Design a protein around this nucleic acid. Sequence first.
RNA 1: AUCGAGAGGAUGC
Lengths: 559, 263, 49, 114, 65, 102, 196, 43, 141, 159, 84, 133
Amino acid sequence: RGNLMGKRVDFSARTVISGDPNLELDQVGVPKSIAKTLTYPEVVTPYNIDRLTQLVRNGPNEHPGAKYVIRDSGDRIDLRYSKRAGDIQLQYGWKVERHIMDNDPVLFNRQPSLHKMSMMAHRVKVIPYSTFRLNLSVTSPYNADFDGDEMNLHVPQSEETRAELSQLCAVPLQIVSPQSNKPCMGIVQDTLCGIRKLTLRDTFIELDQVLNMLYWVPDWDGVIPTPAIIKPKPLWSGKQILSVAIPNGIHLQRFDEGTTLLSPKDNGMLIIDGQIIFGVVEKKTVGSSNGGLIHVVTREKGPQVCAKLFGNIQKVVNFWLLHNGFSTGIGDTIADGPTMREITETIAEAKKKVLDVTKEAQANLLTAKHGMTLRESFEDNVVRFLNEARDKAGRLAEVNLKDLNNVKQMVMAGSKGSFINIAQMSACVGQQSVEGKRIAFGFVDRTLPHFSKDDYSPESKGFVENSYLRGLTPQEFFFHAMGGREGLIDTAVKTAETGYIQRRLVKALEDIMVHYDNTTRNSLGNVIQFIYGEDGMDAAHIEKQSLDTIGGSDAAFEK
Amino acid sequence: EEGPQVKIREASKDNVDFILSNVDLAMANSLRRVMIAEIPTLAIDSVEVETNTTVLADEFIAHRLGLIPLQSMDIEQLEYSRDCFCEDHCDKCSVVLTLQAFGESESTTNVYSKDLVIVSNLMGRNIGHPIIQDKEGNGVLICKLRKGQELKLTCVAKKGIAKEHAKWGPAAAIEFEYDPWNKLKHTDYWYEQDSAKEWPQSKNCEYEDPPNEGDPFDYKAQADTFYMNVESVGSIPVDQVVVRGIDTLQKKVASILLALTQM
Amino acid sequence: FDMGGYFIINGSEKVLIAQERSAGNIVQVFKKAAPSPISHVAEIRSALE
Amino acid sequence: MNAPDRFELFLLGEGESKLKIDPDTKAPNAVVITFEKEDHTLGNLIRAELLNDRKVLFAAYKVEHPFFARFKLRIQTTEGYDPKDALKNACNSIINKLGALKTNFETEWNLQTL
Amino acid sequence: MIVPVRCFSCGKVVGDKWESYLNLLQEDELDEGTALSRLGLKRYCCRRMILTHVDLIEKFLRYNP
Amino acid sequence: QNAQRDAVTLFCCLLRSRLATRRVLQEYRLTKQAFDWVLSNIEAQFLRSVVHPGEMVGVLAAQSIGEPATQMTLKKVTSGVPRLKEILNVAKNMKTPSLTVY
Amino acid sequence: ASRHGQKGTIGITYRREDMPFTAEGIVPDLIINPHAIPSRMTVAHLIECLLSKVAALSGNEGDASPFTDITVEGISKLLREHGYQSRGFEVMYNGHTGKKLMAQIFFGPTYYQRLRHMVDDKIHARARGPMQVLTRQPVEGRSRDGGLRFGEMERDCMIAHGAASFLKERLMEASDAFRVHICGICGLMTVIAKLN
Amino acid sequence: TLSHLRRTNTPIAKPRQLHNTHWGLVCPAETPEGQACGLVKNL
Amino acid sequence: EGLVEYIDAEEEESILIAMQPEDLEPAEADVDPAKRIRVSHHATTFTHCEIHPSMILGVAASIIPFPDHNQSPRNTYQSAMGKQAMGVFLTNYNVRMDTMANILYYPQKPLGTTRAMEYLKFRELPAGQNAIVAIACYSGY
Amino acid sequence: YDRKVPSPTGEYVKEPEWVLETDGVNLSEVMTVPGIDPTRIYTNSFIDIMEVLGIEAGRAALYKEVYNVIASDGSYVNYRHMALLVDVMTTQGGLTSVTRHGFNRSNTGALMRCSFEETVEILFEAGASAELDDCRGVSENVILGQMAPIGTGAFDVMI
Amino acid sequence: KAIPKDQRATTPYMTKYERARILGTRALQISMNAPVFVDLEGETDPLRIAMKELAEKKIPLVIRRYLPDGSFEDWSVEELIVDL
Amino acid sequence: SNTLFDDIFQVSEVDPGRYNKVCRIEAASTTQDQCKLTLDINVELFPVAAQDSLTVTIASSLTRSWRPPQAGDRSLADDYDYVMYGTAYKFEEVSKDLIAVYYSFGGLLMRLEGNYRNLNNLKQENAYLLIRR
RNA sequence: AUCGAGAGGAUGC
Ligand SMILES: [Mg+2]
Ligand SMILES: [Zn+2]
Ligand SMILES: [Zn+2]
Ligand SMILES: [Zn+2]
């Protein structure tokens, strides 16, 4: 299990990883010092003696060059010592183990690998500084932020080995994934929180930038587009030029909630050909969603075109935003005084509502719902009455947040964050839970020794009344501490169960592969499915289409 | 004169507060950058070490010594050590210096940059003098020593520029504001009630004019006037920083002009 | 500033990390499973100080 | 350890010119010059003055990667007027505004006290 | 550990100004506040180069040989 | 050839609903040339969507279920990873059994 | 990283020039990205910053102690009196360009800790090295100019990709591979290889 | 250092939880990640 | 003089403790909306009071400013990372001779301190510099 | 319980229906009741559904569950995959669990099951049974450092 | 046994696995100064050359596709369509 | 090359629809009673308010890099203050005897409603819009 | 070199 099914192996490397907004999707920053070490065995041939003899001469120490040259007899000429090292006449059907160069294929993975996608061929850019660099949007399917995760790289040794990476494993060909019959690489962070900021109706670029951004895009036809605004001053819309990014015959339709061909909320999305017509560009459009641009552009134009598309959007968005700025102050969690009265007067009517149910339960009026403890339908009654107080006070602070709010704005792009995060940060944190019950009695009939026995109310059983801004209290702290802990606990062993499952899951279907009769079988040749997935179709290409023979009136049908 | 209109209000040995009327913003900037980055200077850049029983390690002090403010007045006639035809250094490219001290007393012996000592021929140019702005008269504080600790050193200071290391930089903080009321609306101020009872009025809001509620947006207007202020470390005095900035900017613009001729 | 509490052995600073055990000499009752012949067991870990 | 010696920010290497000039294949009367060992303090000035010139259709620069000291300036001009001139006339136009700057300052500095 | 020369963030020499700091506090009895301002530290990164810095050197000095 | 007819059936029901005579002409006014293509297109466009003889679907399906399993962590039923565990074990000792009469 | 589990690597280094900067002339030492803020919800980070600024100015200690009567409000009212806008924003100017920044930016002093784990102590690569003795496989750890384990779990994704020729070389050409003889009859390794 | 001198092993029903009675004695927050998480405490 | 008792978790089981010695037991006779919301006095039997709640913490979290304003597992991370933070690990590092030691060129005591940093001797052997930080979606690196 | 269902007129509409949920399971006898629809009733035990309604009804039940796991979280895995897995168990006639007991004791080359759980003993009783091992499974060919009849390795190549 | 010139089900198209391997298999031959069957209009990468040899249907190889029972099918790389 | 529609419109509703540099505007047609217009206008570039009246054009006229001005010395189809250039997406049939075209000036939108524009407001890519006075 | 323990990094949002 540790030496045949998985071997230690040569021709490989590993460093830390860092995000490079100026790399093509399918590329990989190899630290020079690594590129100086790994070696492809290349053959002597009329096509190459020239680039090659050069490299042999170049030496195993300045960059493009080689250690070792290999002969007729098959003996090892060692290019870091050897008397005839600034010499050597390369003689056809010999081998020059050169360094790794730009545009080579490489298998680049991240543990733990739970995908075909956690192993992808990348192109090579030899660079300065010793971090392995990659384009943000090759993030999701490796699952690596830059907080300090390491990453692995392997280098092929036969020509065919190359092919096999560059035709099957190569990143672009992964962009829309079997698993979920949708894409898996997206528009992430800044670019996301930017490609919205850029897009708002109010966002007008003027000439100076407009020209640069144009330049900035690498495939730009050199034909400036006519400005939306021509009046007192010639301006362009955000949408206006982003559009330059988008190729041709790319069509796209949405409609959100209030979306009426005019979308007076800039709702939905309409993309006619290389251009954009109305509505904000955000996650639903530009993230690795289903109906979205990436899923389109791939099936439409190619992997390659889409692959490129990534770079294009960023190279621009990055730029626009680079000059615009963005941030988050604590003032982005503050909210109105007259709301900070409503939030508290919304808690204090839920607290005084638990108090009555509590007082009623104690007068044995509280009716037992069918099939459950009298206590059980107090425990449930309260939790519901406290979660409600939160979402309520929470949402009461989503309504107070202005449009100029940064936090509120990332959420709008869906760059990071959600509701809860606001409610937590600005209004009230919530009920703590351990094995899904509000804080237990560890001490006899109480929670802390600062409490009296037989106290069931929210302040005593783990309700954190306060926000993160206002500040937790001693008890509150200690409770929330109790909870959060549980988080850490399982993640150190929810994963150990998960990881057993997978190994089994994998070890059991392993060798099931469609055969050349389209039947689906194992090594015994026993059918499992007579056609793959009940229709002999590969998952990738498939997408969600409405069968509108189904709904509608018998009437509306005939019409 | 003809165009770019400078005007000082307050000025000193280290501060030049000045409007800079009638320019492109694009420029004003490039001026400030080239100011911080590309104006050559002298500072230590090679430490030969005889003895050091300090509580500090060798390569620390060597670092400390780098930063020390040395006279770059006549600097623009000292020759780049990369250029000058001599094997390592010479007095045509370098001012060599010496530091020794030695614990003499019980009570902690300091080691100031006044204790620095030129050795090589100055050919009579004004260069390489450890600058002291200190009132007491002891520039910087290299290191400290107890009863029996030596320190023997050999500084070879060479021409260089901030782009190569912030030692060779001859500035620090460069104050920079334009259009103090947002008349150009280049910014979008963030608020909870009155944008103007929430942010502060910058000292620069007197020279210029208020907006007056009734007036609409002035769109076609651009960037004039740049409320700058240059502080100085003081290898080069304030006036020469701005002077030589303008200068080196112009100088390197020009190398392109020459490059185009040479093709 | 060194505050001690360690040891020295072969020349390396060594710390004893306090171990933790459930206390001896204490009565506890312990409800027990459904496919067990035993409903309730009471345990006492008895050892001499 | 992989780090690239500072001085490769302002010193030209080998077989490298302070300019390579190339014709844009897309438009006509269009050109993208390279600027070795340079950056914003220099690109940004060139362009924006290159935009005061009324006989220039297009002008822009781009730092392709901050790892390196380059920046590419693409310039498109009216029929006839070869861009090298637009670069030229503008290059000079700055030297001038700079020449006055120096002097005008020079004048004012001399007048203060302290 | 020996007062830095020149704050990382502004660049303004801050070495020379350790000693003076001490006196202006502990002699003519000022608060660190107005004490940092007499020394010409208006900007606060360079304000923080001095108020924070912790002069451990004093300690390493204590050790004999 | 019967397993063939069966295997398309669903896809065709669409096909026919979207290539309905009233539609083709009334809703998105095609042409002969344009149609001939729309057709010639689908044929090829389809043919590309078949599973390739080679595809190692054992692993695929495992992984494809394994991953989102790992994405699990935290109204009373055995759900999340443990339920998954109970499912693959063929669990005779199941925690929440339930009928759901209609 | 910092002190609020807001750990991070240096992605790039910028010179004081290209950096954004305040109108007083302050550059910032480091820049974090306002995305690592709403999901890990660390708000104290935000506070300490605000408090610090006040402390840099007033030349006082910032009382960051847990359960205390100290408000964001409380700090602001102070930071207001002190010449800046009460919640830690400062109008900043992009540095490539000079053009003022369309949005205000949060900006303060904020205790940041350099952690162990530098890149250069990890950056390990091998292209054939020494073997173990028992297996004839490459040796563990980088400390011996090691070999990287193509782990079982990895192999599965090479089966997954359907790239077999790659999977054979990664487990043969490099890693092991050995030449032994076998008997046409008794199908074992009894065959005495009397070569030559 | 100060921390490593105050550490608590526990070898091997619910023993990694932070439990009511820990208030004032064990540190509710300090504790190591993954491997033996929650078992080890600091005073 | 008996003003303090040592209390263990077993005995803990039988007492009634108060958090703030002040506000938590004078009279019962206007209110800053900025301050958090503290529960009540609702006990009348109080045997003991707490020294300072801050003290429920240990050595590594005592280095966290405003932990009472943080989401919880976050407090733990910093707790785990204080231990890999670099600085003055002992004054006598020059003399001692152990495999591996790192010290900061110019460490600093933080700008925001804990009342508890005081007895942990942090202000005096700190690990970390008070660097000027800017939260901002710059370039994009 | 909610329900979308056909009005005569054509449209689907909202016809809500009372539904009974349970703790514990004896289907053998709740379906035989009056007042209830014994085409529609559902027990989340798919192991019971297997016994009562036959091996093929059990297929879907397993699935419907495996599915309700995946999408209770909010995820979505395309049918083919879980379908594959569902079938995988349900073809050896009964429910064949994903653990050494079930899947890993059925025919298949020894070298193979060797790579799972009961490593040695597999080989042991496989040496005494005088097993023959095909050499058609992934694991088998990895062990011998050969090109595995897998994608790229499915076919031979000739001239 | 065999399987006849006609009577063929085997997706007539090219399985990516087939192709990748075919490209590979020439990409090998090419890179070992073996003769070339197209005009290298400027490329000299052996893999990039095989991609040309395919795009012009001049690769003298037959796929041998293996059916689960032990039979099999031959297809020259002329016969197969190459969509993808 | 020529004009494609003209009219004089009456401002009835100005909508700061949570914006600062754009308004959605509701204008009505003087003369014809079977007409109205919904339109996006940069209120910072050209102010509009309650009870205003603005002349409105189309034209498809006075596609290679939009050169800058140099048009202090050229032809300019503008006596008009305010002028945009977009693309038409849909033409909508609502009963009658009537008709309505939708316009997108890079996101800034327009709805126009009538009938005589049947042979005029073509569905091409070109379509300027000029407001004055 | 080999066997043994322990600390730590990545997923914890
Ligand atoms: Mg990570
Ligand atoms: Zn010299
Ligand atoms: Zn400063
Ligand atoms: Zn034999």
